[PDB]
Amino acid sequence: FLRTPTSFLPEEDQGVFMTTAQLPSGATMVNTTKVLQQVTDYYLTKEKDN
Amino acid sequence: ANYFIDRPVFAWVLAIIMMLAGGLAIMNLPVAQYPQIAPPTITVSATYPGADAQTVEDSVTQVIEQNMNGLDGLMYMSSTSDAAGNASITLTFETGTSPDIAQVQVQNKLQLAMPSLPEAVQQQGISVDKSSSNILMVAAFISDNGSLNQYDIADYVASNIKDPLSRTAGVGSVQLFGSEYAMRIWLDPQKLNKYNLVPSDVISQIKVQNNQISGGQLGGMPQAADQQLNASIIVQTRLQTPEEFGKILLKVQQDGSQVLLRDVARVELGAEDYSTVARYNGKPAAGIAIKLAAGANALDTSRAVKEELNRLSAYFPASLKTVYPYDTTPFIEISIQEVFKTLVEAIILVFLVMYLFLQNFRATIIPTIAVPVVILGTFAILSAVGFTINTLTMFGMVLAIGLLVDDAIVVVENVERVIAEDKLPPKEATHKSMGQIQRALVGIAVVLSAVFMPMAFMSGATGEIYRQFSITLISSMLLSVFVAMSLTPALCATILKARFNTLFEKSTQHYTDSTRSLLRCTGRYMVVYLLICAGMAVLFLRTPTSFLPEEDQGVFMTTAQLPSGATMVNTTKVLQQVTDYYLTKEKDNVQSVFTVGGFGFSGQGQNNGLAFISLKPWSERVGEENSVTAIIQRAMIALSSINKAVVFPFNLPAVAELGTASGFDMELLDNGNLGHEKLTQARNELLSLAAQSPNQVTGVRPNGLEDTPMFKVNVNAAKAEAMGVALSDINQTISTAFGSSYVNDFLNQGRVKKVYVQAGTPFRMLPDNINQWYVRNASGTMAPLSAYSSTEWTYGSPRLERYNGIPSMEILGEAAAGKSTGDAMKFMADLVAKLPAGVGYSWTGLSYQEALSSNQAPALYAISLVVVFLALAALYESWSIPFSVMLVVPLGVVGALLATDLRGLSNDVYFQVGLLTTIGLSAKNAILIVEFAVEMMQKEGKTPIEAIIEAARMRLRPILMTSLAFILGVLPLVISHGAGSGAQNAVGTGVMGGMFAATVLAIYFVPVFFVVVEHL
Amino acid sequence: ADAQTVEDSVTQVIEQNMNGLDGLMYMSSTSDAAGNASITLTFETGTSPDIAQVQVQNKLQLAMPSLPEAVQQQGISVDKSSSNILMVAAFISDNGSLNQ
Amino acid sequence: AQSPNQVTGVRPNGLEDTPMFKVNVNAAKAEAMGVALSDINQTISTAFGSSYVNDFLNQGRVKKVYVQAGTPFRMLPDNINQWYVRNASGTMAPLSAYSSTEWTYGSPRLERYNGIPSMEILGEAAAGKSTGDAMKFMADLVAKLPAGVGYSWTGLSYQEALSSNQAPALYAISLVVVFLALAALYESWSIPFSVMLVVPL
Ligand SMILES: CCCCCCCCCCCCCCCCCCCC(=O)O[C@H](COC(=O)CCCCCCCCCCCCCC)COP(=O)(O)OCCN
Ligand SMILES: CCCCCCCCCCCC
Structure with missing residues (x-):
């Protein structure tokens, strides 16, 4: 009873998830838009099956 | 039922469950001196800096009063408008109304009413508070070495103490006795005259330069493509140091010299509210008042707050101590400890009595374990219904202990008697005796519940105390019946086996021989009974009425009131005299004196002051010479020589309900259209007509302040406008100079504080100062203020008051001798009717x-x-x-009445609950005698006399055991004189004597009533 | 406004009053550099959200007089809703006529 | 970050300090030439920030009216040189005259937890471990930090x-x-x- 790890509730596959994209402080919306476009391209090409 | 006898383990398990639930209850249950008793009130406070009484009543009070409608459960609403610019509207809601709902309704009505108030009271903000009286602690902060003055300590306790606490459990209405820092700017009329400036220019430049400007963003959105930079812009920031406020550039002269604020005014980190001076033991200090919360624990909250102060005492800058005047926590702790001691001593005495009567350790072991089971179960029930452990509930349990003991004794006595005679084994005897007393026990439960419910169903302030008492008694009684039917029979089944005794047998034989005389003069006996009954009524028409007895809470309060128009210097002097007396001629008893001048209970002012006075613990003052009552009655005569003050010490009110059943509070609403002068004339017709008849009303005193002189400035609009100066400028410079002018906020040590502008101290203290200020024409020239305005010395009121939207007067009085309240409030009416036409009463x-x-x-x-x-x-x-x-x-009523009236008590609530307990016990004894009598009549054929005598002989011992045990249990309550003595004596002297008369007269009269009723 | 500007002139003012009302398990407060103050009080399980909002709003106007202007003609937005998105519904243009 | 076998992907839920433009306006120099400090502050604030002026009607709905400087005139530290403020006598003087611009540093988001500043942190537990193990590991990690920091x-x-x-x-x-x-x-x-x-059993 002391060797077992502790937890609250197991993780589940809810069918959705999120990704955050944080740029260096002082960057503008142009660079953030480019970064998010790269993220969208990766997800929509390399994960087109899921 | 009787199926627990065959299964002792079931009964033992039920007992263990009751004990566990009781322990779990007492571990987590709120404790307090008293529960919430007063009807919920909502207080609306508004501040108008510098406004008079009339100006406040005309602008802030009336507008707020006109839009208080649609509130549910609103009994009445009373408003006070002071001369310091404070308007306070209190709305009293009905008992049971949710205070949060009432507060939100009042605040929403005020939210809709706000745009009608002047901007100067809008800027301060109007505070709606769900709170009442009965401050818990007045913990104060003092300076040890020096340097730190009143304002510094007050600012520290406002900026790093008031907010860190007030989140503690049971703490929700913290009030301050100081004022946090501000940026007081004191104007100089001559310096302003030299540079051709006015307070308006100073205020405008402060508003312009002490501003927070939103710079925006370099870059920002929408942005062009190829934008790689995005930063904020800082343009301005609110000033922080008082040296920075002195560099505000008011104007630039043609010569080129710069005029700064420091050149026309003295800037200084001062206070916001300057009309309050707090002193601890003479030393200057500033404190807070912790008004507790609705659902609170009066003990653990105190420990947690003390621990918080110890924890954040290392953050204290230097030489700052954290004393605790007031602090009526030890009184609650001592009261609860004493009641617990009484409860345990009752069990010890009951065991002793059972040993002395039954003379069998096995026999006596049963109640000694059965009683704590019931006590713990009742604690669990009180926690399950949501009842706090307070004085009322514990003192109700003090009668409950005797009620449970009586059931335990009757069950054990019957089982012991049946194993004694008839040679019945313990189990068969238990079955027999329980068959005998089963339905009688349930009938007794119904009778006692019917006796107790009426007290449960009252309303108002009385209703809540009565509800506490009756809920406690009902829970204890109903649990005791079930436990006597279930736990006790199993114990008697499994426990008992196969000098004074001779004296008791001889006494019982004598009693039977005397009771046999029913065949001689029974009718005359009944006649005598009637007389006693009549005597009871006579006693019921002579005992005075009271609400609760005054206790030795350990602290009291003195109020020093100067006559009228008296400055803070004289009030501080008078309070210094008061504290000097209390700390040099009573040093043995008095520990601390915390004197707050300016803060009077009748209202803020410079002619008021109030001193909290603490006392050495009860272990250091003993007897009557060193109690609160004697201390205050000794100090009242000593302080009659305070040389122009009306200082009046007094003890803490019980729950702040009323001044005994003699006090009344009427208000003389003007109604009609008559003004304030014609209303004070009516109030002068009264206070004299009433004093002409001192047989019914004595203390008719007119609560409220009286007329004072008032300076009047008559500005001449025509001349001023003809020669160039607008009336707005004159009216603004006079107001800003003499009566403060909030400007904006500023940042100090990471905290937002106000900025004020006022005239210098020496330039606003005399009528000859007004002709020292100058105002600017349209062409830039400056002209004196005396060329326009004239001066008068009119009369006016310093504290106006209204009731239900009608100007009132608040005449409060007391009843004379034995005349009750009803005759007082009947004589005040039909006396109001003789006043001039228009005025009414409420x-x-x-x-x-x-x-x-x-x-x-x-x-x-x-x-x-x-x-x-x-x-x-x-x-x-x-x-x-x-x-x-x-x-x-x-029979019990008259005995309780005698035992109370011939000792020095009255008709307090404790007397009522003790009377009902004695009534219940007498009814139970009569029920149990008549039950055996009727069983004999209906089962083993007998005559109405031969059966009743045998029943009385059988029931002699249980009555003499329960009554003696109950009398001895409450005996130390009557003799106690320490802390909480009044409640002890009230729940003592009554029952101790009601029980005696009940038992003697019941055992000597029940056969007479039985015979008369059966033969009739 | 700036981050410190907001955190001192708006967040401090609103924060000066909410200390403990019914069940305050914990309190958070963020102040951005885009002019955004986001106090996020969290009460104990079983508290009535309506009563909690009532208490929060009856203690917020004890701080309202200390707030500046241009925070008013936009409006304070007390909310008792959840803090986590339940559903996002996006709207697009099929052919590409309407811009964002 | 150097103990990947227990806690993986620990990151802060906040924003880091940024450079910030600062403008100093000479109150004395401005008041000498007649241009008020209030007017300068209002022009700068409206140009680079915005100004909610009024409401108006669009397709039957009330919307807001905003005044701001154009996109090309709001982007560079030298753009503050193009704005002119009216004198008390009607003449216009450039804003670059009585002003000084510098750069400083400032935080773009300030957080507080329970009333004190905080730096809320996110991060999952490594494979094989559970959330309790990572929780205890981070509670231990905090103890090895400068005095004056806490964990909640x-x-x-x-x-x-x-x-x-x-x-x-x-x-x-x-x-x-x-x-x-x-x-x-x-x-x-x-x-x-x-x-x-x-x-x-
Ligand atoms: C077989 C018998 C022997 C074995 C018994 C075993 C029982 C063991 C444990 C018994 C103790 C628990 C049950 C007793 C009552 C406790 C629960 C009371 C709950 C409560 O607080 O309600 C009170 C109602 O008064 C009350 O006490 C309820 C009044 C109920 C109506 C009574 C009659 C009213 C008048 C009608 C006259 C006509 C007669 C009717 C038959 C007051 O309410 P609160 O404080 O919550 O409210 C506040 C706002 N007001
Ligand atoms: C098994 C029969 C027991 C005796 C008759 C029932 C008595 C009920 C008394 C009132 C309810 C406890």
């Missing part, structure tokens, strides 16, 4: 509850009689028998 | 920590309750022991 606060529902007392005490009659008829299966169970209650 | 679990962590302490007590009351129930149902104290000696 009862408030104390008399209101007694002006809408008064017949709510006896209807349920007649319903109780009807219900108990029905229950008894069901028990005995006849209609005439219950009369000789009803004819026994006056 | 919040959100899901609050409830997980509460449950971990709750459970053993709940086992205790459940065992005592089942013992008492058996003792009451069966009139004996033997079965309550012969049965309660089996729960470890």
Whole structure:
């Protein structure tokens, strides 16, 4: 009873998830838009099956 | 039922469950001196800096009062408008209304009403507070070494103490006795004259330069493509140091010299509210008042707050101590400890009595374990219904202990008797005795519940105390019946086996021989009974009425009031005299004196002051010479020589309800159209007409302040406008100079603080100062203020008051001798009717509850009689028998009345609950005698006399055991004189004597009533 | 406004009053550099959200007089809703006529 | 970050300090030439920030009207040189005259938890470990930090920590309750022991 790890509730596959994209402080919306476009391209090409 | 006898393990498990639930209850249960008793109130406070009484009443008070409608459960609403610019509107809501709902309703109405108030009171903000009186602690902060003055300590306690606490459990209405820092700017009329400036220019430049400008963003959005930079812009920031406020550039002269604010004014980190001076033991200090919360624990909250102060005492800058004046926590702790001691001593005495009577350790072991089971179960029930452990509930349990003991004794005595005679084994004997007393026990439960419910169903302030008492008694009684039916029979089944005794047998034989004389003069006996009954009524018409006895809470308060128009210098002097007396001529008893001048209970002012006075712990003052009552009555005579003050010490009110059943509070509403002068003329017709008849009303004193001189400045608009100066400029410079002018906010040590502008101290203290200020024409020239304005010395009021939207006067009085409240509030009416036409009267606060529902007392005490009659008829299966169970209650009533009246008490609530307990016990004894008598009549054929005598002989011992145990249990309560002595004596002297008369007269009269009823 | 500007002139003012009302399990407060103050009080399980909002709003106007202007003609937005998105519904243009 | 076998992907839920433009306006120099400080402040604030002026009607709905400088005139530290402020006599003087621009540093987002500043942190547990192990590991990691910093679990962590302490007590009351129930149902104290000696199995 002391060797077992502790937890609250197991993780589940809810069918959705999120990704955050944080740029260096002082960057503008142009660079953030480019970064998010790269993220969208990766997800929509390399994960087109899921 | 009787199936627990065959299964002792079931009964033991139920007992263990009761004990566990009781322990879990007492571990987590709120403790307090008293529960919430006063009807919920909502207080609306508004501040108008510098406004008069009339100006406040005309602008802030009336507008707020006109839009307080649609509130549910609103009994009345009273408003006070001071001369310091404070308007306070209190709305009293009905009992049971949710205070949060009432607060939100009032605040929403005020939210919609706000745009009508002047900007100067809008800027301060109007505070709606769900809170009442009965401050918990007045913990104060003092300077040890020096340097730190009043304002510095007040600012520290406002900026790093008030907010860190007030999140503690049971703490929700913290009030301050100081004022946090501000950026007081003191103007100089001559320096302003030299540079051709006015306070308006100073205020405008402060508003312009002490501003927070939103710079925006370099870059920002929408942005062009190829934008790689995005930063904020800083343009300005609110000033922080007082040296920065002195560099504000008011103007630039043609010569080129710069005029700064420091050149026309003295800037200084001062205070916001300057009209409050707090001193601890003479030393200057500033403190806070912790008004507790609705649902609170009066003990652990105190420990947690003390621990918080110890924790954040290392953050204290230097030489700052954290003393605790007031602090009425030890009184609650001592009261609860004493009641627990009484409860345990009752069990010890009961065990001793059972040993001395039954003379069998096995026999006596049963109640000694059965009683704590019931006590713990009742604690669990009180926690399950949501009842806090306070003085009322514990003192109700003090009668409950005797009620449970009586059941335990009767069960054990019957089992012991049946194993004694008839040679029945313990189990068979237990079955026999329980068959004998089973339905009698349930009938007794019904009768006692019917006796106790009427007190449960009252309303108002009385209703809550009565509810606490009756809920406690009902829970304890109903649990005791079930436990006596379940736990006790198993214990008697498994425990008992196969000098004074001879004296008791001889006494019982003598009693039977004397009781046999029913065949001689029975009728005359009844006549005597009637006389006693009549005497009871006579006593019931002589005992005075009171609410609760005053206690030795350990602290009291003195109020020093200067006559009128008296400055803070004289008030501080008078309070210094008061604290010097209390700390040099009473040093043995008095520990601390915390004197706050300016803060009077009758209202803020420079002619008021109040001193909290603490006392050395009860372990250091003993007797009557060193109690609170004697201390205040010794100090009253000593302080009559305070040389122009009306200082008046007094003890803490019980729950702040009323001044005994003699005090009344009427208000003389003007109505019609008559003004304030014609209303004060009516108030002067009264206070004299009433004093002409001192047989009914004595202390008719006019609560409220009286007329004072007032300076009047008559500006001449025509001349001023003809020669160039607008009336706005004159009216603004006078107001800003003499009566403060909030400008904006600023940042100090990471905290937002106000900025004020006022005239210099020496330039606003005399009527000859007004002709020292100058105002600017349209062409830039400056002209004196005396060329326009004239001066007068008119008369005016310093504190106006209104009631329900009608100008009132608040005449409060007291009843004379034995004349009760009702005759007082009947004589004040029909005396108001003789006043000039227009004025009316209204009862408030104390008399209101007694002006809408008064017949709510006896209807349920007649319903109780009807219900108990029905229950008894069901028990005995006849209609005439219950009369000789009803004819026994006056026997206990008259005894309790005598034992109370001939010792020095009154008709307090504790007397009422003790009287009902004695009534219940007498009814139970009569029920149990008549039960055996009727069983003999209906089962083993006998005559109405031969059966009743045998029943009385059988029941002699249980009555003499329970009554003696109950009398001895409450005996130390009567003799106690320490902390909480009044409540102890009240729950003592009554029952101790009600029980004695009940037992003696019941055992000597029940056969007479039985014979008369059966033969009639 | 700036981050410190907001955190001192708006967040401090609103924060000066909410200390403990019914069940305050814990309190958070963020102040951005885009002019955004986001106090996020969290009460104990079983508290009535309506009563909690009532208490929060009856203690917020004890701080309202200390707030500046241009925070008013936009409006304070007390909310008792959840803090986590339940559903996002996006709207697009099929052919590409309407811009964002 | 250097202990990947316990905690993986620990990141802060906040924003880092940024450079910030600062403008200093000479009140004395401005007031000497007649241009008011209030007017300068208002022009700068409206140009680079915005100004909600009024409401108006669009397709039957009330919307807001905003005044701001154009996109090309709001982008560079030298753009502040193009704005002119009107004198008290009607003449226009450039804003670059009585002003000085510099750069400083400032935080773009300030946080507070329970009333004190905070730096809320996110991060998952490494493979093989559980959230309790990572929670304890980070509580240990905090102890090796400069004095003047604390740690507070919040959100899901609050409830997980509460449950971990709750459970053993709940086992205790459940065992005592089942013992008492058996003792009451069966009139004996033997079965309550012969049965309660089996729960470890
Ligand atoms: C077989 C018998 C022997 C074995 C018994 C075993 C029982 C063991 C444990 C018994 C103790 C628990 C049950 C006793 C009552 C406690 C629960 C009271 C709950 C409570 O607080 O309600 C009170 C109602 O008064 C009350 O006490 C309820 C009044 C109920 C109506 C009574 C008659 C009313 C008048 C009608 C006259 C006509 C006669 C009707 C037949 C007051 O309410 P609160 O404080 O919550 O409210 C506040 C706002 N007001
Ligand atoms: C098994 C029969 C027991 C005796 C008759 C029932 C008595 C009920 C009394 C009132 C309820 C406890």
